């Protein structure tokens, strides 16, 4: 096949001007979409913090209007999901992964409005879920929508545009143009057969969407940690050890997140009403906690800065950790719309700082700063639970900007994926397609 | 569908044998790459010290400069044409082939030929980079262990050949991320699926950087300081810069190729006019690396200086032309050694220029020419060799001005878009395709 190869090599990196332009459009749209989505969740958490001032005294009355508020939005969310678009529950990433393997339909006329508005619900009420879920799915749909509305033909476009939409969305979720692209080519793209996804394309989209996200959320970052110190070479072994711990814990967290999906199904049968009512029940539980101990609720983007600086005690950390494991399982497994990324960054930080503190007073001659350990572990859960180390590394990197810590971060995140492998854990995004897909065969 | 579920559940499972082997390939390329670096330092030491020897008599020194690079260049070209012909030029295009199983990996040959031979062309101070030597040297090291451990199967042979190449590109710039991104943007078989385990490639790159740092820690190749930021009303400027890089990118490809030709005529393919034409160009460079050093050498030393806005506009245009003229001469002539490094330098220098003009055309944008230099630094790599994603990340890992990510991406993309619409081709593919179609003609 040598003759054929020379023909191919000279035709490499040539993507039809039609796709390139359409990618520009998709990014632009996901961008605005993601921006608008963000504006909304802001607002809804704003009302909730404003209505808690309104009923300022009478403690038990307030503890009631916190719960009842998250509870009322969660419900509105689960309902909008189970009734109009079943396939929008959960994260949303496993569903786009399938769509690239052409094994799940991309019902955009449904999912766009259901996941958008429905997510505002579970996220506004302050549940422990991220943005990626909503946006990566939302994004890919936007990508299908324009493939459909411009009746574009061919395997290339349907894959490429469904991809760039998904990336643009993940970027706009963290202001991470690089991570968005790296994610598509580490976990989105069909992982076993070759696929005609044009990389230049995916880019043009991610860029447009980031430019959009910056037009509106400029002059303030999600995570600000300041320039941490450096990591001496005789310090590295420590980060391996951290990775190992992340590595035995990563599969375990997968067992639960899955086994919890089960245990919670028994509690409502598959019934719209015990679900929605079980929904506002968990949703409310969180909006209440987002007052009596806020570090156990919400996305988690707020406790990163605080925890990294070494402001929590060892006690408050261990608490925060357990409390979050127990609410992330509860919110994601229950099938409310919304990703597991963000909460996973939070758990990683918190666990990292813990390691960091213990490390700091075990070795004074290394002159550590627990904050670096919080930063190496931040993208470690993403590397042992999710099995997408390369995207995590760069995701952390684009949000905390402490490139001097690239070695540590890599080593920790690698120890993670090695130990997650040798203890039989599986990529939590695949294990979820594989379930949702083998359940489409075990009913014939 | 039944088959996919079977696959999904078995995803990201790379046989413990390969993973372990990747570790030793990295470790090996790391030490190798370090060793190589140490040598080139040394040989440039000597030349700088022997110029002190014969300190006065101007024309006598202008002679011992020339004759020195001339002597090492020759020693290089010879060691190449005699024992390992497939080690001349880059070396990246040859490993690309090896992944498509269309070129042999004569490690028992290339390892020592490219290593010692490169020392030669690089020590004499020619305008070529370290990536060529190391990416190739690296992959070979990768075959060597597949061979020496008789490892069986498609997976290993691809996987180890790749991690080796990466680890090598890393250690060349202390760029663990660029290394991996490069394999998955330009190294891996670009049209059929391939069983290259990423987790594997990583373990290797890591081991090798860890190695490179054990010896070259405490000092970075390019230091530019934290430059200012870039206002959103400024971006359109970086698109324009990308466009200029996008029309110039293919043209530089034409020459780089067309000069490969014009220089063959000058020696027929004959080992002696080659080697004598070698030390003639090699010598020309080591001479210039005195009467105007910014036109010679890899180029890593003029980045800092140019970015700070230390050159006048006149000295910039000069430095530019003079460099096009020597990068073409050195790479096209088929001396061992990549083209990356010289291309980063040319992008900087062209960027600064844009920058100055920009700075006094718009005083209300409050610009610093320095940022243009940094958006352009990886723009040649994005319009000449069509690997924007690796370029962006390669600049980024070496200048650390993440706040410029937007500009950088926009210039670099304006580059690959215009390189596309004015018909250029990935300079690394255009070189395989030539060397592969000359294999059947």
């Amino acid at each position, epitope marked *: 096949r040598r003759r054929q190869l020379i023909r191919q090599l000279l035709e490499r990196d040539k993507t039809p001007l039609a796709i390139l332009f359409m990618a520009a459009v998709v990014g632009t749209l996901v961008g605005l979409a993601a921006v608008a989505f963000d504006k909304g969740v802001a607002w809804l958490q704003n009302q909730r913090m404003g209505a808690l001032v309104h009923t300022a005294d009478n403690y038990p009355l307030l503890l009631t209007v916190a719960f009842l508020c998250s509870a009322v939005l969660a419900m509105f969310g689960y309902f909008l999901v189970r009734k109009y678009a079943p396939e929008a529950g959960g994260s949303g990433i496993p569903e786009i992964e399938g769509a690239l393997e052409d094994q799940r339909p991309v019902r955009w006329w449904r999912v766009l409005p259901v996941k958008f508005f429905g997510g505002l619900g579970t996220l506004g009420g302050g549940m422990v879920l991220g943005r990626e879920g909503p946006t990566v799915q939302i994004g890919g749909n936007i990508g299908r929508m324009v493939l459909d509305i411009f009746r574009l033909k061919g395997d290339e476009a349907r894959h490429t545009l469904l991809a760039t939409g998904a990336a643009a969305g993940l970027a706009a979720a963290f202001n991470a143009p690089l991570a968005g692209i790296l994610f598509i080519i580490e976990e989105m793209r069909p992982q076993f057969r070759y696929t005609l996804i044009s990389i230049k394309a995916v880019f043009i989209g991610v860029i447009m969407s980031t430019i959009m996200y910056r037009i509106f959320n*400029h*002059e303030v970052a999600l995570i600000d940690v300041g320039k941490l110190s450096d990591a001496p070479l005789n310090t590295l072994w420590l980060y391996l050890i951290l990775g190992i711990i992340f590595g035995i814990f990563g599969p375990i967290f997968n067992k639960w997140v899955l086994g919890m999906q089960d245990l919670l199904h028994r509690v409502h049968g598959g019934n719209i009403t015990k679900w929605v009512l079980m929904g506002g029940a968990i949703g409310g539980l969180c909006g209440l906690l987002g007052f009596v101990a806020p570090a156990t609720s919400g996305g988690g983007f707020n406790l990163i800065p605080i925890a990294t600086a070494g402001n929590f005690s060892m006690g408050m950390l261990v608490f925060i950790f357990v409390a979050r494991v127990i609410t992330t399982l509860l919110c994601f497994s229950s099938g409310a719309p919304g990703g597991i990324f963000a909460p996973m960054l939070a758990l990683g930080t918190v666990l990292g700082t813990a390691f960091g503190m213990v490390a700091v007073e075990l070795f004074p001659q290394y002159h550590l700063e627990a904050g670096t350990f919080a930063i190496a572990g931040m993208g470690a859960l993403l590397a042992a639970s999710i099995r997408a180390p390369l995207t995590g590394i760069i995701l952390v990197l684009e949000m905390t900007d402490n490139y001097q810590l690239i070695l540590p971060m890599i080593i920790t995140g690698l120890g993670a994926t090695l130990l997650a492998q040798f203890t039989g854990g599986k990529p939590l995004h695949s294990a979820i397609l594989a379930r949702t897909l083998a359940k489409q065969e075990a009913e014939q | 569908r039944r088959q996919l579920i079977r696959q999904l559940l078995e995803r990201d499972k790379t046989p413990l044998a390969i993973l372990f082997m990747a570790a030793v390939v990295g470790t090996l390329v790391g030490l190798a790459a370090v060793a190589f670096d140490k040598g080139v330092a040394w040989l440039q030491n000597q030349r700088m010290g022997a110029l002190v020897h014969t300190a006065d008599n101007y024309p006598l020194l202008l002679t011992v400069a020339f004759l020195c690079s001339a002597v090492l260049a020759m020693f290089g070209y010879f060691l190449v044409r005699k024992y390992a012909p497939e080690a001349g030029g880059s070396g990246i295009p040859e490993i690309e082939g090896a992944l498509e199983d269309q070129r042999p990996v004569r490690w028992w040959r290339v390892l020592p030929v490219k290593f010692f031979g490169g020392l030669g062309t690089l020590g004499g101070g020619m305008v070529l980079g370290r990536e060529g030597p190391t990416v190739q040297i690296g992959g070979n090291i990768g075959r060597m262990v597949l061979d020496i451990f008789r490892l069986k199967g498609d997976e290993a042979r691809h996987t180890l050949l790749a991690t080796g190449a990466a680890a090598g590109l890393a250690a060349a710039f202390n760029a663990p991320l660029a290394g991996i991104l490069f394999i998955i943007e330009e190294m891996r078989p670009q049209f059929r699926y391939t069983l290259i385990s990423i987790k594997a490639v990583f373990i290797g790159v890591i081991m090798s950087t860890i190695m490179y740092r054990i010896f070259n820690h405490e000092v970075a190749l390019i230091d530019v300081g934290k430059l*200012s930021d870039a*206002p*959103l*009303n*400024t971006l359109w400027l970086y698109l324009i810069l990308g466009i200029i890089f996008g029309i110039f990118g293919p043209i530089f490809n034409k020459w780089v190729l067309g000069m490969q030709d014009l220089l063959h005529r000058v020696h027929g393919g004959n080992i002696t006019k080659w080697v004598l034409m070698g030390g003639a160009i090699g010598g020309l460079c080591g001479l210039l690396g005195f009467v105007a050093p910014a036109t010679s050498g890899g180029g890593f030393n003029l980045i800092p200086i140019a970015t700070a*806005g230390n050159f006048s506009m006149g000295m910039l245009v000069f430095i530019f032309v003079a460099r096009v003229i020597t990068t073409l001469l050195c790479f096209s002539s088929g001396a061992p050694g990549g083209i990356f490094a010289p291309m980063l330098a040319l992008g900087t220098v062209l960027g600064t220029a844009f920058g100055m003009v920009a*700075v006094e055309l718009f*005083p*209300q*944008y*409050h610009l*610093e020419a320095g940022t243009f230099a940094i958006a352009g630094m990886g723009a040649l790599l994005a319009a000449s060799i069509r690997a924007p994603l690796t370029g962006i990340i390669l600049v980024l890992e070496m200048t650390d001005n993440y706040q410029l990510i937007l500009p950088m991406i926009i210039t670099g993309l304006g580059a690959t878009l215009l390189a596309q619409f004015t018909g250029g081709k990935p300079l690394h593919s255009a070189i395989l395709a030539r060397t592969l179609a000359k294999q059947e003609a």
Partner: antibody, heavy 120, light 107 residues
Framework: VRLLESGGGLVQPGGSLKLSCAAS????????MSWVRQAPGKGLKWIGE????????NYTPSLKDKFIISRDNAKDTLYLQISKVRSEDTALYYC??????????????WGAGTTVTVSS | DIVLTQSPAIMSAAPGDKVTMTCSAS?????IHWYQQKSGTSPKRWIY???KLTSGVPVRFSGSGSGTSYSLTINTMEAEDAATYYC?????????FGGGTKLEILR
């Protein structure tokens, strides 16, 4: 975060004087700095700006060495030299730290003022 | 260089009143900024990029315009708004301030 200008008061007409603004509570790199003046009971007139690496220093349309804006990032301090002082320069000088949104620069955090009085 | 000119030079109004001052420009400016100078205080960044509010500027305050016309608008004025307001543009070099509207209160 606070700017504290000083060193005004009396000058002989045709004389000259060094105002030193002095900064604290923010990385005094990272910023362009600027001066502006308010003659008594009147509007605002920009004198000049200057970046962090003292590489670029612009002035208002005015004469050859009328003003000299300089800064020294060791002491966290901006300076201003006025020369051959006519009575138009009788004013309050503000120093102000510079910045931007979409991109058009604005005078961000202003100092407190110093007064200059040109008289015999 | 650009000559910005401000409309009411002095304007009385009683708290409650919706209030609008104006900044007009001889050429084409964009993204103008506004300062509030109270008595014997220094100018304070008030509204920037035509309609963004500096942090902790009461939401009664708003800005807009484009081209040659720009206005800052107090919506239900309040007595503590008694100040002198400068507009300022930096869209063309060198930058330039207005003459300043002086707000005055009627009580």
């Amino acid at each position: 975060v606070r700017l504290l200008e000083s060193g005004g008061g009396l000058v002989q007409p045709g004389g000259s004087l060094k105002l030193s603004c002095a900064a604290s509570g923010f990385d005094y790199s990272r910023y362009w700095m600027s001066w502006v003046r308010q003659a008594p009971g009147k509007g605002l007139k920009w004198i000049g700006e200057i970046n962090p690496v003292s590489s670029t220093i612009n002035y208002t349309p005015s004469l050859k060495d009328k003003f000299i804006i300089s800064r020294d990032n060791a002491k966290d301090t901006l300076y201003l030299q006025i020369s051959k002082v006519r009575s138009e320069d009788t004013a309050l000088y503000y120093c102000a730290r510079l910045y931007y949104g979409y991109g058009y620069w604005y005078f961000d955090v202003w100092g407190a003022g110093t007064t200059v009085t040109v008289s015999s | 260089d650009i000559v910005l000119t401000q409309s009411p030079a002095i304007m009385s109004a009683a708290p409650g009143d919706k209030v609008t001052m104006t900044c007009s420009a001889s050429s084409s400016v964009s993204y103008i900024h506004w300062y509030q100078q109270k008595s014997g205080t220094s100018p304070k960044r008030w509204i920037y990029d035509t309609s963004k509010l500096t942090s902790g500027v009461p939401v009664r305050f708003s800005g807009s315009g484009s081209g040659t016309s720009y206005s800052l608008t107090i919506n239900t004025m309040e007595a503590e708004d008694a100040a002198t307001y400068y507009c300022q543009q930096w869209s063309s070099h060198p930058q330039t301030f207005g003459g300043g509207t002086k707000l005055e209160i009627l009580r």
